[PDB]
Design a protein around this motif. Structure first.
Motif, PDB file in Angstrom:
ATOM      1  N   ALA A  96      19.825   7.353  19.687  1.00 32.13           N
ATOM      2  CA  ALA A  96      19.335   8.692  19.375  1.00 32.13           C
ATOM      3  C   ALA A  96      20.486   9.608  18.988  1.00 32.13           C
ATOM      4  CB  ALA A  96      18.585   9.268  20.551  1.00 32.13           C
ATOM      5  N   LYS A 129      21.341  11.418  14.900  1.00 32.68           N
ATOM      6  CA  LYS A 129      20.942  12.812  14.589  1.00 32.68           C
ATOM      7  C   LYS A 129      21.542  13.224  13.258  1.00 32.68           C
ATOM      8  CE  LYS A 129      18.601  16.032  16.795  1.00 32.68           C
ATOM      9  NZ  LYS A 129      19.131  17.377  16.449  1.00 32.68           N
ATOM     10  N   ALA A 154      13.095  11.434  14.438  1.00 32.88           N
ATOM     11  CA  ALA A 154      13.493  10.136  14.968  1.00 32.88           C
ATOM     12  C   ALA A 154      12.306   9.193  14.880  1.00 32.88           C
ATOM     13  CB  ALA A 154      13.942  10.294  16.429  1.00 32.88           C
ATOM     14  N   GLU A 155      11.168   9.732  15.250  1.00 33.89           N
ATOM     15  CA  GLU A 155       9.948   8.991  15.254  1.00 33.89           C
ATOM     16  C   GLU A 155       9.515   8.534  13.872  1.00 33.89           C
ATOM     17  OE1 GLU A 155      10.476  12.988  16.964  1.00 33.89           O
ATOM     18  OE2 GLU A 155      10.937  10.880  17.395  1.00 33.89           O
ATOM     19  N   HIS A 157      11.962   5.609  13.572  1.00 30.15           N
ATOM     20  CA  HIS A 157      11.582   4.402  14.286  1.00 30.15           C
ATOM     21  C   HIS A 157      10.573   3.740  13.353  1.00 30.15           C
ATOM     22  CE1 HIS A 157      10.470   2.513  18.482  1.00 30.15           C
ATOM     23  NE2 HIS A 157      10.741   1.605  17.560  1.00 30.15           N
TER      24      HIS A 157
END
Lengths: 138, 140
Positions: free
Chosen positions: B22, B26, B36-37, B40
């Motif tokens: 994480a 950034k 981030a999601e 992913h």
């Protein structure tokens, strides 16, 4: 060489896919959603502030608040003097979480040589240490 | 108490991998301007191509957002659709390079002092366990 990095990303995506499924019943029963428990999962270890939870998650602060609050509200998280712990009702949750992880972890490590698992946990404690030592540095 | 020690460690271990990946991404997700999601959601495509449903419980976290963040990918025009499976851009690979790259520039520099039999055995054990886990899953 870095098939490792992929394998890892895949190993972790699979323990998340699996964890979710075994925990679905226990989560609805508690009205708590996955990320809310996944926060119930972080706080199991140490008492964070909502800020510390975001940084340790990559996600949107706002949603960490949506969750942190819905939790206190649920009397699962017990704020301290903004550093939050785990309400004693949130404890009985955690007891019931490892109660299921265990009946499956052993169910898949029936045939293992602990004397062998030992050594890998040594290697994983060192990489872990090295990864934590990066929690820091800025 | 008894073997709970090894999984509590495994979980504290994944945690740190997540925390670090994480932090270390950034500046990068911000530089491409994505969450981030939805990242992913983007690494799972560097493997192959995915259906909104193919990811639902396969991600764990439901199925609503699967489209909501798939669309900004679609729309930010760096992940291509299919019919409801979805492939990757080809300028989205550019990013995943940027991701995979820096994640190694560091992981090796984090495990380089071991040589082999050491690491290969951890991998071999996580592989069997990953084999077990998957077989054990088997559901909607």
């Amino acid at each position: 060489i870095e098939d490792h990095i992929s394998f890892l990303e895949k190993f972790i995506n699979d323990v998340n896919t699996l964890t979710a499924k075994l925990l679905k019943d226990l989560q609805t029963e508690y009205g708590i959603s996955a990320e809310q428990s996944h926060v119930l999962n972080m706080l199991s270890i140490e008492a964070l502030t909502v800020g510390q939870i975001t940084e340790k998650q990559g996600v949107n602060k706002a949603a960490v608040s949506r969750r942190v609050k819905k939790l206190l509200n649920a009397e699962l998280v017990k704020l301290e003097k903004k550093i939050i712990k785990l309400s004693n009702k949130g404890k009985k949750y955690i007891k019931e979480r490892k109660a299921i992880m265990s009946h499956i972890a052993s169910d898949m490590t029936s045939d293992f040589d602990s004397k062998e698992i030992e050594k890998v946990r040594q290697v994983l404690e060192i990489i872990d240490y090295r990864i934590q030592s990066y929690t820091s540095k800025l």
